[PDB]
Amino acid sequence: MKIKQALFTAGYSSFYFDDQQAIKNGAGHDGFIYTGDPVTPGFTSVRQAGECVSVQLILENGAVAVGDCAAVQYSGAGGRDPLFLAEHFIPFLNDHIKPLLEGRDVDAFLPNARFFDKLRIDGNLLHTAVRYGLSQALLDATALASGRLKTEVVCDEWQLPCVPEAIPLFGQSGDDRYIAVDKMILKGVDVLPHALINNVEEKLGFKGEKLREYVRWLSDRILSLRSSPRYHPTLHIDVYGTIGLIFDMDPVRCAEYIASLEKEAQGLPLYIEGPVDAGNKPDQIRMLTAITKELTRLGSGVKIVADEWCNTYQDIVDFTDAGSCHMVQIKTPDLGGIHNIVDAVLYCNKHGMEAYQGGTCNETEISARTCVHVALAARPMRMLIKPGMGFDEGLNIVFNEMNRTIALLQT
Amino acid sequence: MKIKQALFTAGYSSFYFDDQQAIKNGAGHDGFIYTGDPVTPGFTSVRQAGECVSVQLILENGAVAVGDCAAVQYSGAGGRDPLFLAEHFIPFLNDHIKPLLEGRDVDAFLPNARFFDKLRIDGNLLHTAVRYGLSQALLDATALASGRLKTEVVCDEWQLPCVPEAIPLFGQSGDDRYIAVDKMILKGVDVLPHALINNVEEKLGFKGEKLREYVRWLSDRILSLRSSPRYHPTLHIDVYGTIGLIFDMDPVRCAEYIASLEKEAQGLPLYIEGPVDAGNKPDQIRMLTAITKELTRLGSGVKIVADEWCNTYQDIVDFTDAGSCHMVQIKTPDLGGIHNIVDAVLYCNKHGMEAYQGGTCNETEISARTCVHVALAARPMRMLIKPGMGFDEGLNIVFNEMNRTIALLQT
Ligand SMILES: C[C@H](C(=O)O)[C@H](N)C(=O)O
Ligand SMILES: C[C@H](C(=O)O)[C@H](N)C(=O)O
Ligand SMILES: [Mg+2]
Ligand SMILES: [Mg+2]
């Protein structure tokens, strides 16, 4: 079955494009807005509305497959592609991509996914968000053309068993790290709460005591508010590199502080994401490795998670091959085509790496819903609740699609 | 085409259920919740997780139609049904509704909508939430059965033109009445921002001076933040009956105060929702009517919107026939089956009432999306960005489905 028509429509994503460089440089705020000038190219303000381009593929049987082109919050940075402005992309996609979609067969997914993932227009690979969104629509197209769910298509093309089982979900709080923790306990969240620990003075503390107290409050809040002791979630907190900054980038000292955090967790397993940011891929790998070695040496139970500098399928391979850390964030939109997500989760699973199928608050209901199918197939150990910073909406989108899908499969 | 199988799966909706008058009474606060004793039946806490029940209808052609059972935040009051918990409704659904669904013809939508809207089980009508959800899935089923969009099915069956054109959207800030305003300006929202002006002391002011100052703040923010004068949104603020409280239900005084806000809006049109709560339908209609009369007499351009006591199709008919206000909130889940939304909006449109197709923060991505199709067909004057209180997620849901659907229709 073929695609009869391809449509591209501008839209709003579930968060904001932020100029990471200007913010790190110390941009001030006025309400929700950041002040000063942006320094990153394409930005009209330090903070701007997040945008997406919805792809709809009307098939010969009349079904309408969907996918959303979307980029991370910090669109333009850390090895991630540029400022994804949608209006500009509509004419471009209508002109160069539409004729490559209309009349295309979608009985299978992968050959199509590979094609768009490698395509250059005037020498330039397609923007990674376009690859993300097209690939979602193509997966959905294969599903709709054959009476399968997206999950089944992946299972079939990658020859996976497709045993219907929940994926642990992870909630991110943004700066609302107290109120959102309550929300997450009320809704049974498996993993929590990110906490956006992204400033040294005000969030980590110059000697780490602020984070220490935060973990204690968090575990106390969980134990106290839970309906029963059967609720025993995992703690996952992203420190956006700040721990290296207070320990002279010495991985032994970083490890030491990290281990010291376990006590405050009160039996809840603990994960610390992005402990350091050495500023380039090779050094990031090596520092994470050295931190992991010392945690082991200490007999620590605390685990660490890579994110920055770990972007593409190949990066994920590299961090994994090096034994650098216990888990890596597969930040979905930065991989491009979603077949890359499947490939990356399987590689991790084969080689011992815990795969966290993450993403961004700045993607959509469609991209998240598509990611749910990818996860139910590939079996990562953790999935980000997304998109949005409200949390409730994200949980609604990911959790309910997961459970609907498991039921359909059990049929 | 018939439905082959009906599945019902538990999920989370995008907000919380709250025992109202457990709270307004004196329920304590600790972080995100309320301490102590709920007054409302079924409730294990004064606030707990909002819930839904996803209805999935697998048809003979293998398509899967979807719809979500959901209820407002304070299920329980203003003329609303009980506590919509999944563990209760899933058995009820399997016991009493599945037998009427499996094998059912879905070639049309309206018979089925009407049939379930009237159905009695042991003498009782079905819960509005159940009727809302089934009806969404039944409309989706008719669509998927015949290669139509849900919006087209409504157009076909009520004989409407379905001109592909946008509907003005309204965002709601929840208590975050400052910060969410910046979000909305940055996303160009048509109407804003609700403001949850729901307490005399802290939000409206004993003499309405706080709301007065807020309106000026809001208009200034808009005029300051916007990128050009082309952005001229409508201001829409819900004061949840507080204006009636500080004026002792004196309607001429209410009107006078409401007219004095125009000055503060600086030329942005102003809507005040729920100015009073007379605690009963017939008094509510009378009070709103006298407020409207006095506004007109003063020559004011401020309009008022009904909400509380205007629940069902028939309520809407009654508020409309009395000429009681300029706009009514058709609070979607309370009408039961969504064909009633259609009839309500058309009724308003035919009898000089502005139809505001509302809903709640506590519904779902699926209910909202389905509400988009109802609106493109019926043409209310305004539609709520929902669900959730994060705003971004809701806009993403409602605005992107709207634009995607318009693009399909133009095909
Ligand atoms: C999940 C991401 C991370 O911090 O790793 C980030 N908060 C985002 O939403 O894009
Ligand atoms: C939109 C409603 C209203 O206040 O009219 C309410 N905020 C709700 O979300 O259910
Ligand atoms: Mg991270
Ligand atoms: Mg209201």
Q: What assembly state would you assign to the polypeptide chains in this entry?
A: homodimer
The number of distinct β-strands of chain A equals 15
Superfamily (CATH H level) name of the largest domain in chain A: Enolase-like C-terminal domain
Q: Total helix count of chain A?
A: 16
The fold-level CATH name of the largest domain in chain A is TIM Barrel
Q: What is the CATH class name of the largest domain in chain A?
A: Alpha Beta
**What's the arrangement of strands in the largest beta sheet of chain A?**
8-15-14-13-12-11-10-9
Largest sheet of chain A: 8 strands, parallel
In total, the number of domains of chain A comes to 2
Rg of chain A is 21 Å
Function (chains A, B): Involved in the methylaspartate cycle. Catalyzes the formation of the alpha,beta-unsaturated bond by the reversible anti elimination of ammonia from L-threo-beta-methylaspartate (L-threo-(2S,3S)-3-methylaspartate) to give mesaconate.
Cofactor (chains A, B): Mg(2+)
Pathway (chains A, B): Amino-acid degradation; L-glutamate degradation via mesaconate pathway; acetate and pyruvate from L-glutamate: step 2/4
Protein name (chains A, B): Methylaspartate ammonia-lyase
